[PDB]
Amino acid sequence: STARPRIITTTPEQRYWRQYTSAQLVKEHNSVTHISFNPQHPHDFAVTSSTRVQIFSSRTRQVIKTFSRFKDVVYSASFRSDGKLLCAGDATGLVSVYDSYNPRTILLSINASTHPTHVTKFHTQDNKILATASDDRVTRLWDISNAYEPQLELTGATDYVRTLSFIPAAPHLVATGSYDGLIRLYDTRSSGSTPIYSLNHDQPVENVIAVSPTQIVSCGGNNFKVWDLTSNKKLYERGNFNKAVTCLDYVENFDSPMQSALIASSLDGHVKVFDPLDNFQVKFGWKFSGPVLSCAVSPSTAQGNRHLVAGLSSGLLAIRTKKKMRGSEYQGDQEHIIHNDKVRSQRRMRAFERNINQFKWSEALDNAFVPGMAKELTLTVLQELRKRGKVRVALYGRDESTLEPLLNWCLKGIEDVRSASIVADWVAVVLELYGNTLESSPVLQELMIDLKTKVRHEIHKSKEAQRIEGMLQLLT
Amino acid sequence: PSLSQPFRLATLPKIASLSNFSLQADYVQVADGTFNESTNNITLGISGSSISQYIINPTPKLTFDYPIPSTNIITACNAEKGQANKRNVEIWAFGLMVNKGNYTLNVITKALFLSQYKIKAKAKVMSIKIDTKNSLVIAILQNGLIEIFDFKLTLLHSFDISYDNLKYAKWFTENGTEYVFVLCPLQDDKVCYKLLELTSSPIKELSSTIIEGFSFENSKLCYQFGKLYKLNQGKIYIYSLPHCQLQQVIEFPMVDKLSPGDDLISFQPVSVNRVLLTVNNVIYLLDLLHCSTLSQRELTHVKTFQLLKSAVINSEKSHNSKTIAIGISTKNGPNPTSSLEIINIDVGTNTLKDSLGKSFQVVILKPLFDDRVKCNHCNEVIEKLSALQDNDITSFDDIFFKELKIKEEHYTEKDRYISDPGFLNKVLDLIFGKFSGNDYPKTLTFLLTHPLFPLSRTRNLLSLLRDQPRLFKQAIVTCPNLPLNELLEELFSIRNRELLLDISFRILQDFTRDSIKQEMKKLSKLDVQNFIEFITSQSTQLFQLLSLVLDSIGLFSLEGALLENLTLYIDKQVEIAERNTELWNLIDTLPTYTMEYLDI
Amino acid sequence: QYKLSVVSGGKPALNNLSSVTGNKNIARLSQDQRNYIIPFNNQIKVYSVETRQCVKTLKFANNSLLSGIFESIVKILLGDITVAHLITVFTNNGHVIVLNYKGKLVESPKHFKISLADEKLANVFHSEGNYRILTTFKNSLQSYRLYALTFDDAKKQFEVAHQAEWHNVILSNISSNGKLLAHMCKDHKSISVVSLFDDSVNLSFPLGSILSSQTQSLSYNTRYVSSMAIDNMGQQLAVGFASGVISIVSLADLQIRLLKWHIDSVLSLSFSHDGSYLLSGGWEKVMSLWQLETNSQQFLPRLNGIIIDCQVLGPQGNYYSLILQMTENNSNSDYQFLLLNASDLTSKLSINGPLPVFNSTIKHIQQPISAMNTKNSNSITSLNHSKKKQSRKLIKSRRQDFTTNVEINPINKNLYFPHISAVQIFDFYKNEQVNYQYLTSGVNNSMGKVRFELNLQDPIITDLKFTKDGQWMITYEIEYPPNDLLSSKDLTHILKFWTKNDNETNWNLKTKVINPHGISVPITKILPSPRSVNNSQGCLTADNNGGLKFWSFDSHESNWCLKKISLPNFNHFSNSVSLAWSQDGSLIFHGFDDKLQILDFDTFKKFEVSEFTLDSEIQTVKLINDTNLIVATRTTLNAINLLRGQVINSFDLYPFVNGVYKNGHMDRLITCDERTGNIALVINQQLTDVPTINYKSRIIIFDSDLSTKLGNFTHHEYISWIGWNYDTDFIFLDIESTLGVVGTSNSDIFAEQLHKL
Amino acid sequence: GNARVTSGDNFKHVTGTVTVILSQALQSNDHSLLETVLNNRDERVIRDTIFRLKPALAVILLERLAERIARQTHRQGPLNVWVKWCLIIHGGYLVSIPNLMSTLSSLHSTLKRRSDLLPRLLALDARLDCTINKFKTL
RNA sequence: UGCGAAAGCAGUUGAAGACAAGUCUUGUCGUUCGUUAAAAUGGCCUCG
């Protein structure tokens, strides 16, 4: 004897990103310009909005620390690699360094320039040195010990520098992008103050990130281009965006089926996922109420629920989260023989499956047309009964009162292509069995009248589709 | 696979030794190291003139020349580029023999002269290999000595194979290790084959075998990918290393007709199981695995062409199917002039696709069994039929049907024995010659129904049978492999209703939509217009043919005024078809008080 | 060089006599109950119940005596009658043979012969040293005679003494003890029960008294007894009817008791030893134990087949031995013997032979009787007319294919039989089934079909093939609609690709393509790709419209995709399509109707003569080697050299094959080695003075290009199939389900005494 | 199990105008924006919108309609109007395209399924028309 | 039932013998010759 067979009723990369279901929407006093994630557990993220920086708990998704000392607008909240410190730039030109989770004490305050300092980023390989880019168009490289004069002062940008990146595995290299449309690479090992070379983007560069040790991806204007340092030319370029792409983030070696992800903001309200393993092709997207200025995703070693953060110019902050008898326990580890014969119970059957298993043909049909019944699942029971050869049998003991639920669905299912052929079979039988009762039942007549009008409408659609099909063949 | 036209490299000098065209190839040596698939240089040793290096592309040009006195014969030459103590250098090793009195081994180093060295060799140098990694020059002598030298020609090691009169020595690399095999003649057509490995002694002997029945004097030898090929008396013997076992003998009929002494033959390999064979002025590309002649080319402007060397492709590993071969061509005239020429060769994909239908090797129903169970002379017939007098329909039918015992005027399964195509082709020739005009025999009807009707006669049949409607009707229905280019022509030209429908049925049955559509485009716009006008005046097989036409005509060519008639006409047809479809499906498909009269 | 030898086994043997019901099973369980002895049509297998393995096999071919004798075994008796692992085999004619299991078979068994005058031995049985034999002699009803059998040591001969006789026996059964015989005669009918070794029980009564009045009013299915069981005590007698109703009769006073569960004909009834339980089985594939005290019932559903016979085996009812039928396969009667453990109703031992599905019914097979005449069953009336029609078809008609599709797994060399809607994986080295897997949807084991449900047709596996690597299985299915509907003529064609790791035994469906090649377009040919292309990860499917589709397995998409297509929408149809592929993979030979085309794989179109016109439709196109291509038409077979484009040899096949086989079956009759040569197989009916049901087949080994016949051999029975094992040998299947192969000191006494104790 | 079903026709691996919104939606893959464009049901607006739409963007518009029809067949009718006008207006452009089946495989397959219903829809209609006539006259 | 493709294209059903019912007329077949030729209220286990 064999167990009874069970009745048989997108991309994996998309299905993973579908899982960020829980959406929380927050309001800020002004446009959120920058978003950064703490590299260490609990991987709290800091949002720079108006004159304050707010740090959000990952699990709670609520503000836990507020840094409100800034008198003018703040322009960065990047942490150091070890996550103890965070540096912030101000429109006044002062860059301030605070201990994370300790807003009161100020470890270091440096006056980079009199012009606004928009970018302040810690060097990833070296903790001691901090980078600052200002509207002075010089990206000074500071050291925390030396707070009075920069270690180096990179220059050569003829317009605002709002982007600065450190290439991983290349501590000596520094990448800066200016509104000239030029991306400049500098060597701190040498004298500096003159770029090794310049890469032309042809549009103002709004953010530059180093995706890998040899590949750097820069987003400027309406497209983002991936450049290879070894060849010093763009490998690939994607321009699916409509507005000007603003921010872009990269996460690698996370638990998704896809190894690496590239998140890019658009300023049209779109933030989309690009897969570097498939030539930076679109694989996902989200839409927001207004333009997106900043995007961030929780680091690879999140150790908990993953977070996707979008920053909008209206001040809205959007968070999408992927949530991550004393002998009864012996188990017989010391015994000679272990015998296991228990069998798990089969997964719960539905009402219609139980009726079919028990040969309740008429009742199985009734379960098909019940309120709140999935259309696909309603089609299976109708197909199962046909396969069993029980279509007339399911329709004998019926009158106008219990025939209308079937005809109502047939009135809607004739329109669908998948159920059109099945509806023809069932409707053909009921007419052959209930011709006489239809004459004496006025309600059954109008059900057939509207059924005849709809089936006539379907004929026109199918005739129409043949004509476009003939048209399409002529073109090719 | 194809063979390109030779293009001249250089003109050989007019020397007495080179005047003997039969021995000219032996006096020109091609360096192995410089002549490969990826190299653009050829280092060539011309006996008595010089050793020269030529760049092949973009134009043949001489890059370097080392003059040699005219009394010298080049016996072995090799060149290889490498690093020597580190500067990039090119090492040239050549051996010269002067009247048999003395042998000279010479090594020349060039900067990419840095040094030149000369020693007296004990015997004639047969093969020279240059090992740039170890800075060694290895020379094989006719007396069985293999001597290893540095770039300064200081003797480092000397190995004796214990056999003299060495005639063939070839180097080859396998799995990174260098190997060399040699062949030494013995008496009574016997040969010792030795395989040596180059690593107290850098030379290790792996196999030594005696081969019987292997003659040298009339044999052409080459080696490629572990196989040694021997051409002798029109048969190619294939010997397989490391024991040199005879694997296969391939008979080449086109050589068996060659008179012994006048025909000049050269034989070199070009790829896996593919070689080049030249007979006088003709060049052949042969596939030995399939025994096929992939390509053939005759050089009408030269008397003879001798292969010297060919850059061999390892097709199993290389996606490139193009290589080159160098040879010596001799011109026709009272003052023949020899020139070095290079030929570009497309070897192909090494697949059976290239070889099909190209065998260089040149029926009757047999009972399945030689000997109480349920049952389920062509040459004579042709002579009898040919002996009749012209226009004798009755006898021609009587002889054909009676002799072959054919019972029906149409082909049946019982006429399988007659299916020998040769007999059918001759009878068709007879029927055409024996009968002309308006009276053909019934035999033609039988043949038209024959499934193996010759393809050669299919062309123009519809014109020949045009006169008689009955024969024309038969050919459309049953004649096999009727060309479509014709069938369309009669389709748009014939006015008979019946013939049009049958032609429509036959065209769609035996030809694809894509195939027909291409030929419909060729038809004139007026003829298709008449065909469209014909329709407006089984039917779907005609309409589907119309739908194919409209696609062939295209959207530009169609004209509005006619388009309206066609649009009106079809709308009538669609209404009728919808009407009939409705008909077809139809065929497939108490009162409280009552007054009645009682029956008493 | 070549030689033929039978290797695998055949169907289990059964007491194929219409009258006897409930005594069909001949397999016997040892007195120690440690092993089951089962007779096959060509051997006797001894299975160990505890370990579930065939410990011993007694092959008839090995013995000269059994080879001369084997006729069919009518019974097996434990021990030797004439005189601890002996068995006495009684054959229908009268040969009595004493064999031994658990040891080495002796070349001189104690052969004997009971002397019978124009009688066919039907059954034998014993209680304590006393033996009786039942024999059949000739209204189309056979009569029976009961003798007493004794062995006289002086003459060493079996003497038979008449005891009783009955005429016009319709149905018969014997109690579990073997001491009571119940039978029904036309003397409408009358049932009589007789004690066999004593005169204690002797009763007779007309069936009319037992039958109910309503039954007399209703149709004949209600009055037609299909099963009968007699209790050991003789107090109770169960009668089963074609209606599905069982009636227990108290013999003392002819009181009736009705048990009604079966919706269709009840096929098997058996009493328990104490008589307190009744096993019943029929078309539902459900075994019912009726508890007679409370009239309750316990069920064992979803069995493999309909239950032909039921028995309780053991002093304490330890086991239930059932015979299952698998009525899905109409081409043959497929019996499976199932020994269940009574305690937990788990299969203690299941035994069956290979289960091929031939194109047409073979020999004298008849479908089991049902309440209605369906495709899988016969009615009570339909039996005689169907038997006559079967004989008349086998004699008069000309189409005699009986050819079966079989596949060989390159990795395991397992033999795959596409049973209807399932696949049987059979190991011919061990001669034992290794798996049975359902590969299609449908009503397969969800329920037992009864009455009108029995007209339903499950999806049929029309083609089944393996890739050269062997890691992928390609199946093609035809799903049929139910009748009496608008969509009752739209067949569904499905293609499926399965994968299986070598360690496991179950194939897993990886891809399903519904309606490949369009709607209502069959896949007439499937050809797996060579190792050169995609590393054998591809295949071609070809239609009767000349379409070709090339599927390949894509790692990125991770599953099979339609890589290439060529759809010439020809307006003509032909099931005669053949496909060949060069080992290099460059060219594909597609034969459609009477024309062969050479298509370049890279462009997947006609080569740029590739057209070859043939006399008749091509049934098979195969290449023995890269050079030669063998093409079989309906009238001849030809060897064409591709390199020359000329026919080397041509052999005439019209005399032997004119209309015997449907198009496409020459492919499964013609097989081809990749090294040495190919084989042609030709079957001929035997007739002496109108065709007879007997057939004789002949194998011809042909070298490449068919110049010479390496071997010409004859087999004495129709060979359904022949294919090339991936070794040198070829395996062929014969309609008796037989797979043959054509191929190239005081201590010592103390130790003995201690062992005895 | 987890096997994905497929079909043999999957040739994948072998004023008042809204044109500017349509063009931006198509370029940016903005489903929400594209949906608002497709909601209009006025045939005058449809033809005009496709008329001024750039020929390059016409091809992708056919792809989007093919996908949207496939997911929801009930919208087969209204979007067939969009497809019909794209072919008529941009017929010349579509001809000069290297490949059509591979890029319009979803469209061609989608159109095949609707036509297959036509033989059976007539069969149902005939049986309906017969029974509708029978009681209406009675 | 035969051929064929899945569409279809051709064709086929007779002579008895025995019994049951009515009362001479009808049915049935655990029966033969020939021809390629619905319905006994009766639904599928336990192991949570």
Curated annotation (Swiss-Prot), chain A:
Annotated localization? Nucleus, Nucleolus
Keywords noted in UniProt:
Nucleus, Repeat, Ribonucleoprotein, Ribosome biogenesis, rRNA processing, Transcription, WD repeat
Look up the record and give one Gene Ontology term from the biological process aspect.
Answer: positive regulation of transcription by RNA polymerase I
Record's Gene Ontology CC terms?
90S preribosome; nucleolus; nucleoplasm; rDNA heterochromatin; small-subunit processome; t-UTP complex
Segments annotated as WD repeats: 27-68, 69-108, 114-152, 156-196, 200-237, 240-284
- Superkingdom assignment: Eukaryota
Q: Chief localization class?
A: nucleus
This protein's record includes keyword Nucleus:
yes
Name its species: Saccharomyces cerevisiae (strain ATCC 204508 / S288c) (Baker's yeast)
Q: What else is known?
A: Present with 358 molecules/cell in log phase SD medium.
Name recorded for this polypeptide: U3 small nucleolar RNA-associated protein 15
Tell me the subunit arrangement.
Interacts with snoRNA U3. Interacts with MPP10. Component of the ribosomal small subunit (SSU) processome composed of at least 40 protein subunits and snoRNA U3. In the absence of snoRNA3, forms a complex with other t-UTPs. This complex can associate with pre-18S ribosomal RNAs.
Q: Does the keyword Repeat apply?
A: yes
Curated annotation (Swiss-Prot), chain B:
Gene Ontology BP term (one) = positive regulation of transcription by RNA polymerase I
Subcellular location(s): the record lists: Nucleus, Nucleolus
Q: Which GO terms describe its cellular component?
A: 90S preribosome; nucleolus; rDNA heterochromatin; small-subunit processome; t-UTP complex
Q: What keywords were assigned to this record?
A: Nucleus, Phosphoprotein, Ribonucleoprotein, Ribosome biogenesis, rRNA processing, Transcription
Q: Which InterPro entries match?
A: Utp8_b-prop, Utp8_C
In terms of superkingdom, the source organism counts as Eukaryota
Q: Name one GO molecular function term.
A: U3 snoRNA binding
Principal place of residence: nucleus
Miscellaneous comment in the UniProt entry for this protein: Present with 16800 molecules/cell in log phase SD medium.
Q: How does it assemble?
A: Interacts with snoRNA U3. Interacts with MPP10 and UTP25. Component of the ribosomal small subunit (SSU) processome composed of at least 40 protein subunits and snoRNA U3. In the absence of snoRNA3, forms a complex with other t-UTPs. This complex can associate with pre-18S ribosomal RNAs.
**Purpose:** Involved in nucleolar processing of pre-18S ribosomal RNA. Also has a role in nuclear tRNA export. It acts between the steps of tRNA maturation/aminoacylation and its subsequent translocation out of the nucleus. Required for optimal pre-ribosomal RNA transcription by RNA polymerase I together with a subset of U3 proteins required for transcription (t-UTPs).
Q: What is this protein called?
A: U3 small nucleolar RNA-associated protein 8
Q: Which gene encodes it?
A: UTP8
Swiss-Prot record, chain C:
Q: Which InterPro entries match?
A: WD40/YVTN_repeat-like_dom_sf (IPR015943), WD40_repeat_dom_sf (IPR036322), WD40_rpt (IPR001680), WDR75 (IPR053826)
Cellular location(s): Nucleus, Nucleolus
Q: Which PROSITE patterns match?
A: WD_REPEATS_2, WD_REPEATS_REGION
Provide a Gene Ontology MF annotation, just one: U3 snoRNA binding
Task: List the GO cellular component terms.
Answer: 90S preribosome; nucleolus; nucleoplasm; peroxisome; rDNA heterochromatin; small-subunit processome; t-UTP complex
GO BP of this protein: maturation of SSU-rRNA; maturation of SSU-rRNA from tricistronic rRNA transcript (SSU-rRNA, 5.8S rRNA, LSU-rRNA); positive regulation of rRNA processing; positive regulation of transcription by RNA polymerase I
Q: What else is known?
A: Present with 6560 molecules/cell in log phase SD medium.
What is the protein's given name?
NET1-associated nuclear protein 1
Swiss-Prot record, chain D:
In the record for this protein, the WD repeats are positioned at 52-92
Name the residues that span the membrane.
none
**Subcellular location field:** Nucleus, Nucleolus
- Report the record's disulfide bonds: none
As recorded in UniProt, coiled-coil segments are none
What this chain does, per the record? Involved in nucleolar processing of pre-18S ribosomal RNA. Required for optimal pre-ribosomal RNA transcription by RNA polymerase I together with a subset of U3 proteins required for transcription (t-UTPs).
Q: What family, per the record?
A: Belongs to the UTP5 family.
Q: What else is known?
A: Present with 33100 molecules/cell in log phase SD medium.
Instruction: Provide the assembly information.
Output: Interacts with snoRNA U3. Interacts with MPP10. Component of the ribosomal small subunit (SSU) processome composed of at least 40 protein subunits and snoRNA U3. In the absence of snoRNA3, forms a complex with other t-UTPs. This complex can associate with pre-18S ribosomal RNAs.
Q: What is this protein called?
A: U3 small nucleolar RNA-associated protein 5
Lineage of this protein's species? Eukaryota, Fungi, Dikarya, Ascomycota, Saccharomycotina
Q: Which gene encodes it?
A: UTP5
* Parent-protein residues present: 359 to 557 of 643
